[PDB]
């Protein structure tokens, strides 16, 4: 047929391109990578899980860690958003090409989120194909889903040590003064998700543009005032301007009360 949007989801990263999630990494490593590498050990009572759910706040690394395991376990990766916004003529091809192209991992985002959609999903869920699920609100039940996902992993927000290594990782490549304190930034970014840090750095990086006299309007013509922008450094005043603009996202403790209990 004419639906090559599935090939626009396939793949064929690195587990150390991810900062932190040390507990989450060992779980996904034992659950996906090891079973493929020592099958004689992971059979019978040690049969691998065929699916699990990653539940945590938004923007704290669920898609990166999903793609990383696919790279470490040499799995072909299938990424799918839960937005069918006719639609069902894809899952029976996604799972078809997933089983077809050896071991594969299907990551679907926001399972909380087109009528008879869950039909063909469960009708295709119920070689190796490991499904990795992520939701921001695991409170949303639909027990037909909460049943078919036994392992529920809570993936949390970074601590101050993982925050600093994130803040430094984002600022790399960008011109900046040395007077910047990544320890103070880490301390002042308590409660920030992983995506919040990038939004902080993307903001301070362009606060360099805002501290400029915008009357150097120009347009179409390149000005010495615009070749001056290339020399400008991100400074603490930008991070000060960023910290009062970028805010984070009791709110995230519900995933602990949901993953650790029923």
From Swiss-Prot:
The protein, known as: Meiotic spindle formation protein mei-1
Assigned EC number: 5.6.1.1
Organism of this sequence: Caenorhabditis elegans
Primary location group: cytoplasm
Keywords: ATP-binding, Cell cycle, Cell division, Chromosome, Cytoplasm, Cytoskeleton, Isomerase, Meiosis, Microtubule, Nucleotide-binding, Phosphoprotein, Ubl conjugation
Subunit (UniProt): Homohexamer; ATP hydrolysis initiates a cycle between an open spiral and a closed ring conformation which is probably involved in pulling tubulin dimers out from microtubules. Interacts with mei-2, which may serve as a targeting subunit. Interacts with mel-26, which targets mei-1 for ubiquitin mediated proteolysis. Interacts with phosphatase pph-4.1.
Location in or out of the cell: Cytoplasm, Cytoskeleton, Spindle pole; Chromosome; Cytoplasm
Interval of the full protein contained in this chain: 173 to 469 of 472
Gene that this sequence comes from: mei-1
Molecular-function GO terms, alphabetical: ATP binding; ATP hydrolysis activity; identical protein binding; MATH domain binding; microtubule binding; microtubule severing ATPase activity; molecular adaptor activity; protein phosphatase binding
Lineage: Eukaryota, Metazoa, Ecdysozoa, Nematoda, Chromadorea
Record text on activity regulation: ATPase activity is stimulated by microtubules, which promote homooligomerization. ATP-dependent microtubule severing is stimulated by interaction with mei-2.
Effect on the protein of changing residue 210 to K: In ct46ct89; dominant negative
One GO-annotated biological process of the protein: striated muscle myosin thick filament assembly
Annotated knockout phenotype: RNAi-mediated knockdown at the L1 larval stage results in the disorganization of myosin thick filaments in adult body wall muscles characterized by the formation of abnormal myosin heavy chain myo-3 aggregates and V-shaped crossing of A-bands. In addition, body wall muscle cells appear shorter and broader.
């Amino acid at each position: 047929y004419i639906v090559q949007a599935v090939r626009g989801t396939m793949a064929t990263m690195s587990l150390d391109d991810i900062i932190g999630m040390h507990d989450v990494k060992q779980v996904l490593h034992e659950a996906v990578t090891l079973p493929l590498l020592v099958p004689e050990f992971f059979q019978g009572l040690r049969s691998p899980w065929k699916a699990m759910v990653l539940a945590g706040p938004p923007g704290t690394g669920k898609t990166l860690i999903a793609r990383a395991i696919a790279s470490e376990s040499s799995s072909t990766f299938f990424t799918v958003s839960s937005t069918d916004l006719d639609s069902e003529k894809i899952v029976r091809l996604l799972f078809e090409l997933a089983r077809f192209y050896a071991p594969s991992i299907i990551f679907i985002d926001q399972i909380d989120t087109s009528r008879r959609v869950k039909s063909e999903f469960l009708v295709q869920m119920d070689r190796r194909v490991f499904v990795l699920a992520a939701t921001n609100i695991p409170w949303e039940l639909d027990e037909a889903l909460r049943r078919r996902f036994e392992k529920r992993i809570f993936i949390p927000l970074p601590d101050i040590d993982a925050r600093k290594k994130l803040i430094e990782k984002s600022m790399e490549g960008t011109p900046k003064s040395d007077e910047i304190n990544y320890d103070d930034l880490a301390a002042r970014t308590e409660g920030f998700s992983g995506a919040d840090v990038v939004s902080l750095c993307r903001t301070a990086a362009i606060n360099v543009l805002r501290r400029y006299d915008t009357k150097s309007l120009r347009g179409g013509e390149l000005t010495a005032a615009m070749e001056s922008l290339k020399a400008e450094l991100v400074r603490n005043i930008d991070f000060e301007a960023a910290l009062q603009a970028v805010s984070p996202s009791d709110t995230m403790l519900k995933c602990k009360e949901w993953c650790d209990s029923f």
